[PDB]
Amino acid sequence: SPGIWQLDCTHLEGKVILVAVHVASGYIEAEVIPAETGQETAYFLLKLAGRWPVKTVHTDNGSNFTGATVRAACDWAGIKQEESMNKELKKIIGQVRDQAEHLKTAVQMAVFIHNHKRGYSAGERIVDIIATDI
Amino acid sequence: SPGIWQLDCTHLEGKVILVAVHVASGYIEAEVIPAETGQETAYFLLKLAGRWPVKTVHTDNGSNFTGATVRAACDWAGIKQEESMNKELKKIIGQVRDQAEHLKTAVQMAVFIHNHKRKGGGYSAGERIVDIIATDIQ
Ligand SMILES: Cn1nc(-c2ccc3c(c2)OCO3)cc1C(=O)O
Ligand SMILES: Cn1nc(-c2ccc3c(c2)OCO3)cc1C(=O)O
Ligand SMILES: [Cl-]
Ligand SMILES: [Cl-]
């Protein structure tokens, strides 16, 4: 449970956003990526796994997961494979879109808002969950 | 203490790496950025602050911190601006460099290895940051 994430893609302004949610806490990491390719997906998963203890990722099982680069990345990082945040995040992105030149900045502001919003925030919940596991 | 990070720049292969260390645990976040400019620095700080409780960042106070964009990002996120690892990290990057087509990939494998390495026993930096922050929460 504390090691379980769900990864989804969302599309805005021509670009692709990957959103990983830590299922037990609702905490999110999200990035705008150039294209929904195996190489970018692998890179996103490598970054996530270096930052938080990722044991299993639930994905949409689509084309960007079938290639050798993504497979090698999950294997290397030790990851196994196996929208109630999403409109909220879209909404937050809409709320802040005007204050940033670039979509990637608005996405990161929305991540900040989502994870900090508060009895506990998603940021407090993920730490409490993982600490409890340790 | 739990909210204190140090941010430094490292240069390799013509590119700039920013490395943020969480001072009490040794946990790191690091990225290769296109140039050491205020816009990229601000964006790096926004990202970091959305993921971990960042209260204060100790920097080198250089040119990329003096501009409007960085100051507005720190203000917005509620952040005040008040060699060892960085060589071990450089070494881990060298160790993995040939397995990565791109430097950015090697940097993130080095981040993974640094944060997960259990130096005996007996906690990793990743375990230590979570333990420190949860303690503070309670
Ligand atoms: C509500 N709140 N949430 C956080 C917060 C945000 C992100 C995190 C985290 C705590 O631990 C891991 O990642 C900080 C605050 C605060 O200082 O008020
Ligand atoms: C050594 N090790 N440390 C962790 C670990 C634990 C808690 C964390 C983290 C990494 O990053 C943020 O919070 C996971 C493992 C592992 O089982 O490989
Ligand atoms: Cl996807
Ligand atoms: Cl710097």
* C-alpha–C-alpha distance, residues A109 and B49, integer Å: 9
Backbone dihedral region for residue B61 (phi beyond 0: left; psi -120 to 50: alpha; all else: beta): left
Which CATH architecture best describes the domain B1-138? 2-Layer Sandwich (3.30)
Q: Which ligand is nearest to the CA of B81?
A: 4
Q: Which two tokens stand for residue B8?
A: 């430094």
Q: Which two tokens stand for residue A110?
A: 């929305």
Q: Which two tokens stand for residue A59?
A: 């994905």
On whether the CB atoms of residues B25 and B125 are closer than 8 A, the answer is: yes
The burial class, CB within 10 Å (0-12 / 13-18 / 19+), for B109 is: buried
Q: Tell the residue number behind the tokens 């449970």, with chain if given.
A: A1
Length of chain A: 134
Method: X-ray
| Residue A127 in contact with partner chain B when CB distance is under 8 A | yes
* C-alpha–C-alpha distance, residues B47 and B64, integer Å: 16
CB contact under 8 A, A134 and B131: yes
On whether the CB atoms of residues A17 and A35 are closer than 8 A, the answer is: no
* C-alpha–C-alpha distance, residues A8 and B100, integer Å: 25
| Residue B58 in contact with partner chain A when CB distance is under 8 A | no
On whether the CB atoms of residues A33 and A7 are closer than 8 A, the answer is: no
On whether the CB atoms of residues B106 and B93 are closer than 8 A, the answer is: yes
* C-alpha–C-alpha distance, residues A33 and A30, integer Å: 10
* C-alpha–C-alpha distance, residues B2 and A24, integer Å: 23
Q: Tell the residue number behind the tokens 């720049």, with chain if given.
A: B9
CB contact under 8 A, B108 and A76: no
Q: Which two tokens stand for residue B82?
A: 């008040």
Find, in chain B, the residue whose alpha carbon is nearest to that of A122.
Answer: B51
State the closest ligand 2 atom to the C-alpha of A55, by its place in the atom list counted from 1.
17
Domain range A1-134, its CATH number among 3.30.420.10, 3.30.200.20, 3.30.70.3040, 3.40.50.970? 3.30.420.10
Query: What is the crossing angle of helices B38-51 and A103-116, to 10°?
Result: 30
Please name which of B56, B62, B45 lies closest in space to residue B23, comparing C-alpha atoms: B56
Secondary structure letter of residue B44 according to DSSP: H
Give how far the C-alpha of residue B40 lies from the chain's centroid of Cα atoms, to the nearest Å.
Answer: 14
